[PDB]
Structure formats: C-alpha cells, structure tokens
Amino acid sequence: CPFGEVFNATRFASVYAWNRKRISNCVADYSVLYNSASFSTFKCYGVSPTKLNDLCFTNVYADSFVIRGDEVRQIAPGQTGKIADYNYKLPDDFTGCVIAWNSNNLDSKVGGNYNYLYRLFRKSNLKPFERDISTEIYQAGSTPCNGVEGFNCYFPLQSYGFQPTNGVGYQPYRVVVLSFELLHAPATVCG
Amino acid sequence: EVQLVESGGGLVQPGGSLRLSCAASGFTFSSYWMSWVRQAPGKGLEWVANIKQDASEKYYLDSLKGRFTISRDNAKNSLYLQMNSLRAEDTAVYYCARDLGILWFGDYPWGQGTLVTVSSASTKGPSVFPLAPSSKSTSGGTAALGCLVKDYFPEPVTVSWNSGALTSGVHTFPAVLQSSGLYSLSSVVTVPSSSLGTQTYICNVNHKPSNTKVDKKVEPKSC
Amino acid sequence: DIQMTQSPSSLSASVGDRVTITCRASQGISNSLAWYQQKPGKAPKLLLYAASTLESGVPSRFSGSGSGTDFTLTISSLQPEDFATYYCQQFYSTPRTFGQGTKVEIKRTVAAPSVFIFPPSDEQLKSGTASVVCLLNNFYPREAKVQWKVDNALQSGNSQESVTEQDSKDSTYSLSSTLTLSKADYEKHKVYACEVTHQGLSSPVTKSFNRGEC
Ligand SMILES: *[C@@H]1O[C@H](CO)[C@@H](O)[C@H](O)[C@H]1NC(C)=O
C-alpha cells in the first residue's frame, strides 16, 4: 500500500479543504508506523493498535490536513471547538486512527507563512466527515451581506500565522486520519 | 501568534491630546478590522473605536463626541488612535484588538495595553504618617500597625516593612483617588503585641515617579 | 445601543465545582456573541465565539450555549487558574458593548473581620488635615459595611474605602476605610467610632476612641 504518498508527501491541503485518498487492493502493515516512534500523536479509536491488522476492510480512507498544536486535541471522538464545529468533524462511532506530527520545520516561514486557511465562521456545525468550501460572506448582523465584505460581513476563511519562532502550541502540525470502511462489498484490504 | 503592542500612554493634562500606537504581527493585518478597547481603573471593558480593512469606514462610541479619531497604516502593520480634548474620565488602560466582530487581543506576553492618565496635578511625592497601635484597641495578643501614604501622584508607590524582613501579615491596600486629584493608600501589618517594645517596625515607601523614598518608624502610641 | 446584563456579577465557587454565568441582551442578536476571560491586571482573552464554539487553545472545560437574547457560559470542573473576571460581548452591531462582568471568587467558610481604629497622627494634624482609619482584617465574604460616628453622629460623603484581592493562602479579604476631616472638624469632637456590619458578625461591632486620649 502507498502510505508514503500520504505521509512523506510534499504538499498538504489546509484543513478547510482537507484531502481524502482512497486505498484498496493492497497489503498494508500497520506495525511499521506505530513502532516507528516518529509521530508526536498516534491515537486509535475502536480497533486496538497493538498488532490488530488481522482484519480486512472494504476501503481505507486517509484524510490529510494541517492545523496547529492547540487544535490537535480536536481531532478526536466527540470534541467541540472551531476546527471540529467548522472544519473537520469525526463521529462518536469512530472506527479508525488519527496520526499527527509537528511540521514546524516545513510549514513555517520567516515573517509568517499565511498559506494555510481555517474556517472561522459558519451558520451551523459540520456533520461527521463533512467538507465545506463555501466562501460565502458570513452574516453576523441584521444586514444581509449581498456577497460583499463590509460592516458585520466577514469572509469565512482566515489565514494561519506560522512564524517559526512560535510556541509549540502555535506551531504547524500535519494530521492524517485513517478510516476503515467495511460495507456489504468484497473486502480487499488485508495485511 | 497574534502579537499586538500598545504604546503612547502617559500623563496628559485635561484638554490635551495624545496619540496611541499598536504594532501588529503574526497575522495578515489587511484581512481584519481593528478595534480600540479601553478599561478604566477597575471598571471593565468599554469598546471605543473600530476601523475597516482599507480604513474607508470608522466607528466610535457617541459618548466620545468626536474627540477620538482612529487610523491605520497597513504598510507598517500599525493601528493608531488620536485622542483629542482629553477628559479626566478618559484615564484607562487602552488595548488594541484584531477585529472581525470578534475581538482577538494580543497573545501573551506581547499584548498588554498602554496606560493613559489624565490629570491636572503635577507629580508629587507622598507624605507618610504612622498608624500607631494602641494597647486599648487590641485583639487577643495581636496588634496592628501601619503607614498612611497620602497625597501623591501618579501611581504607584511600593511599600515594604523592615526593608523586607516583615512579610507575614502585610496588607497594602489599592490606592484611592482623593478629591484633591492626589492618590493615597495605607499599608497595615499585624504582629504579636507581646513583642512591641522589643521589635522595630519601619515602613519603606518608594515613590519612583517623584524620586522619593521614605523610611518611617512606627512606635507604639504612648500618650 | 444594545445593552448587556450579566449574572450574577460576582460568583463564589470552589475547585472542581461546575460554574455557569448568564448573559442577556436587550434585543436579539442571533448567535453573534463571544465570551472573554480577564485575570487581574492582564489583557482579556477570547474563550468562545458564535455562542458555542471554543477558540483554539482554550481548555475544553469551557463551553457556551444560547441564542436570541439568552446565553450561558459553563465551566465543567473549576480549576485554580479559572478564577478571574469574565465578560460577554456582542458582535451584531455598533457600538460594541460588553457585559459588566462577573467575578469568580474562591469559596471558603464565613470569617469575621478583625476590626481596628487609628486616630490621626500628630504630624498629620500639624499639616492641617485629619485622617481617621478603620481596618477590617482577613474576612469572608467580600461584602461588608462600614459606618462612621463622630460623637455618635453618622457621617456620609467624607469616607473612602478600598479592599484587597482574595488572599493567595487563606482566601480572605481586608478592607480599609478612611475618614477625612479638617483639623478644625476633628478638633471639634471627641468620640470617633467605626461600626462594622459583616455576615460573620452576629451584631455590628463598633470600635471607638476619644480625641487626644492615648
Ligand atoms: C517515509 O520516510 C521514512 C524515512 O526513512 C521511511 O522509513 C518510510 O518508509 C517512508 N514512508 C512512510 C509511509 O513512512
């Protein structure tokens, strides 16, 4: 299986437009990564991480994005906050894993790197595995916004300010969420 | 990290002006509004001014009656507030905040405001008077003494006891602004009344604004 | 314009307790409300926005509910670092308006104040003013009452008081009340008394002295 295309990948999408990759028809070894001791965060919900690749699922999805350390605690079952409510939400019945590592050396930049965006405004919260690219002018006042920014009419996406001399809580982190789908279909992803 | 640094507060006489600056970094200054929020001495937040991204719209509190003008230079990542015809009620710690309706203030330790103190008094050093303990108004083996630091400007004074040796039971009260325009506080300390005639109690009042230090010996009041 | 009212303005609680603060608006504002925390002397920090969503970096113990005119901020298990003043704001219109704030204090059992009275020093009387001082030492809760009696004549308008912050070690308060008079008005009377009304007192305690005695 081509995990190197997801983890050791060159470019990562920002969290508002996170990147889902489908994985099927290959043999995967999980214990290469968990015992690699290369990630700062590796939490698996549902299945035991300890050598339980003795299963076969229909499909395997890998969702990659970039956030900050303060927000890593939000990529977890039943968590609430900016990222979970407005950017990327996981369901309570999560049969999967979340991995994350500090990418301060690759996503920061002197004077700030403002290439990663996060959604700061939304009328409702995101359903599990929803994805919102709507750059509609969020309405915070009584006036309808009519697509133009102005008094009480803010753009929904806002930049990350990734200076390298940040505290760890403010530094960029790369996150990959693995979901294991077992539907009523021929299972092909075994170990 | 959102770093917002306020500067320019100081002592202005009533009717004078002042210009406050806010240096910003850690985010795209052009994508946000900017707000000025002041907080009077122990009195909570009062939003005073708002400026758009391209500075084509400016909003104020009508209480200010056009005395304040907000400005911003984007090339310098800088926000400015010109305070004209200043009144005594304008005495406050002024903060700048990144604005999208929501206010983001400066992250620690960068964001901490600038203190505007509007007063007609010139800077005076304090007068220290002894609050002497009596053997009549005592309390079960414990006696209280202190120093009254009266008639000074501006803030603050610092008070120690016995040049730092006496710490247990010291209460230095927040300064109160008297009608005369001058501040006054008091520092009290409770000690075993058995050891009055033996132990020496000096209060050290340091007023750095006026370049004044006072060491005052508080002796038990013997009529 | 839009008015904000917070409840209960001052709230006492303990570590591990569950805490709720209420904030109501004089007119509807949908969910365009935010909650801020300010520790003494420091700059305010944004805890919640859009009535419900936690700003990143905020401990998940903070949560918000409400809409329309009614909003509630809830801390699930209070921790020692959560004692501060909290403010609510609206971003629906201008002028941007805050709630008056609610101070979260530390809960301890009632404690009566130690009361003292101090006559003016001879040097201050020489200067031309007389400051009589009354001290309430180490009590709880913050709410107390001081009255001045000059020969059993109740004063009003010539006294100023200030209170300390809750102590780091025993969670008590101490208050100072200063009565300011001219050397004339001081030398016209004999009995100066300070009457203290506090919860931890069964009856108001009066401590008095007489002019020039000792
Ligand atoms: C990524 O690079 C490391 C560096 O040695 C390599 O061991 C690993 O196999 C690569 N792929 C993945 C998926 O980690």
Which string of DSSP letters, residue by residue, matches C172-213?
A: -EEEEEEEEEEHHHHHT--EEEEEEEETT-SS-EEEEEETT-
Indicate if C139 and C86 belong to the same structural domain: no
CB hemisphere CA count around A57 (13 angstroms)? 17
Can you point out the beta strands (E) in C26-93? 33-38, 45-49, 53-54, 62-67, 70-75, 85-90
Instruction: Determine whether the shortest distance from the Cβ of A32 to ligand 1 is under 6 A.
Output: no
Angle at B215 between CA B213 and CA B220, to 5 degrees: 155
CB atoms under 10 Å from CB of B208, counted, come to 11
CA atoms C60, C61, C65, C69: torsion sign: negative
Cα A176 from Cα C163, distance rounded (Å): 54
Instruction: Determine whether the shortest distance from the Cβ of A48 to ligand 1 is under 6 A.
Output: no
Taking a C-beta distance cutoff of 8 angstroms, is the pair A140, C32 a contact? yes
Distances (CA, A) of A174 to A98, A128, A167: 11, 20, 16
Provide the CATH number for the domain around residue C184: 2.60.40.10
Residue located via tokens 């010109």: B82
Taking a C-beta distance cutoff of 8 angstroms, is the pair B135, B145 a contact? no
State whether residue A164 sits within 8 Å of chain B by CB: no
Contact at CB, A81 and C50, closer than 8 angstroms: no
Indicate if A150 and A90 belong to the same structural domain: no
Q: Which of B105, B127, B144 sits opposite C43 (nearest CB)?
A: B105
Indicate if C203 and C149 belong to the same structural domain: yes
H/E element, B160: strand B158-161
Indicate if A68 and A145 belong to the same structural domain: no
CA atoms B74, B19, B52, A17: torsion sign: positive
Q: Give the technique used to solve this structure.
A: X-ray
Take residue C201 and report the two structure tokens written for it.
């007192």
Cα B80 from Cα B58, distance rounded (Å): 12
Helix (H, G, I), strand (E, B) or coil at C6: strand
Helix (H, G, I), strand (E, B) or coil at C32: coil
Cα C54 from Cα A81, distance rounded (Å): 4
Take residue C37 and report the two structure tokens written for it.
């925390």
State whether residue A163 sits within 8 Å of chain B by CB: yes
Last residue of a domain, one of C82, C106, C130: C106
Q: Give CA A2 to chain center in angstroms.
A: 19
Enumerate helices (H) and strands (E) in chain B, giving the number of each: 0, 19
Rg of the Cα trace of chain B?
23
Indicate if A144 and A78 belong to the same structural domain: no
* Structural domain containing residue A152: 112-163
Pick the closest to residue C83 from C108, C57, C112 (CA basis). Answer: C108
Could you identify the atom of ligand 1 that is nearest to the CA of residue A38? 14
**Do you find a cis peptide bond into C113, omega within 30 degrees of 0?**
no
CA atoms C107, C113, C114, C118: torsion sign: positive
Indicate if A124 and A173 belong to the same structural domain: no
State whether residue B26 sits within 8 Å of chain A by CB: yes
Q: Give the strand pairing for C85-90 and B176-177.
A: unpaired
Residue located via tokens 């970096």: C57
Instruction: Considering only the C-alpha atoms of chain A, give the largest distance between any 2 of them, rounded to a whole number of Å.
Output: 57
- Give me the phi and psi of A168, to 5 degrees please: -60, -40
Paired strand residues for C132: C179
| Region of C125 on the Ramachandran plot (φ > 0 left; ψ -120 to 50 alpha; else beta) | alpha
Q: Give the strand pairing for C10-13 and C102-106.
A: parallel
User: Using CB atoms within 10 A of its CB, is residue C201 exposed (0-12), middle (13-18) or buried (19+)?
Assistant: middle
Helical ranges in chain B per DSSP H: none
- Give me the phi and psi of A142, to 5 degrees please: -75, -30
CB neighbours of A55 closer than 8 A, spacing ≥ 6? A47, A180, A190, A191
Domains of chain B and CATH, by start: 3-118 (2.60.40.10), 127-217 (2.60.40.10)
Q: Based on the structure, what is the number of domains in chain C?
A: 2
Cα C105 from Cα C8, distance rounded (Å): 12
Indicate if A191 and A139 belong to the same structural domain: no
Pick the closest to residue C206 from C192, C190, C185, C188 (CA basis). Answer: C192
* Structural domain containing residue C206: 114-210
What is the distance in angstroms between the Cα of C2 and the nearest Cα belonging to chain A?
A: 12
Pick the closest to residue B210 from B127, B130, B92, B86 (CA basis). Answer: B127
Cα A132 from Cα A155, distance rounded (Å): 14
Taking a C-beta distance cutoff of 8 angstroms, is the pair C122, B122 a contact? no
Contact at CB, B101 and A152, closer than 8 angstroms: yes
Last residue of a domain, one of C88, C106, C124: C106
Indicate if A71 and A106 belong to the same structural domain: yes
CA atoms C150, C155, C160, C161: torsion sign: positive
Contact at CB, B105 and C44, closer than 8 angstroms: yes
Take residue B203 and report the two structure tokens written for it.
């209060």
Pick the closest to residue B48 from B81, B12, B87 (CA basis). Answer: B81
Amino acid identity at B219: E
Residues in chain C: 214
Taking a C-beta distance cutoff of 8 angstroms, is the pair C95, C39 a contact? no
Amino acid identity at C3: Q
